[PDB]
Amino acid sequence: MTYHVLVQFDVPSDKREAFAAAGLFDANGSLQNEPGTLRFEVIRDENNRNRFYLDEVYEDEAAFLQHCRNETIARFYELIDSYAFGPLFLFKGYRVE
């Protein structure tokens, strides 16, 4: 029963590259340093150039709660706090079989 978390962010038009870099920093840092993290993808909406999505998967819920208290997500929020709208959690869920 993996734990899935889908997050959504909106950023101003002049901060598209800035957020993409911060999102990729969150992804690579979480994958390189947190054993509970199985997948971390950064996705851009196909039509809305200001809207991004984070598709995250963890071993269980405890691994996500650990991620929320680790250093990588703290630096990610330090990078984007001055412009980004979000997070909006589209869902949290468990994988079916």
Q: How far is 17 from 68, CA to CA, in rounded Å?
A: 24
Q: Least distance (Å) from a second copy to the CB of residue 35? A: 21
Asked if 71 touches a second copy (CB under 8 A), the answer is no
Angle at 6 between CA 63 and CA 8, to 5 degrees: 130
Query: How many angstroms separate the CA atoms of 97 and 90, rounded?
Result: 21
Least Cβ distance, residue 48 to a second copy (angstroms): 5
Among 36, 49, 63, 76, binds a second copy (CB under 8 A): 49
Name the residues that contact a second copy, by CB under 8 A. Answer: 4, 6, 10, 12-14, 20, 23-24, 41-53, 55, 61, 81-97
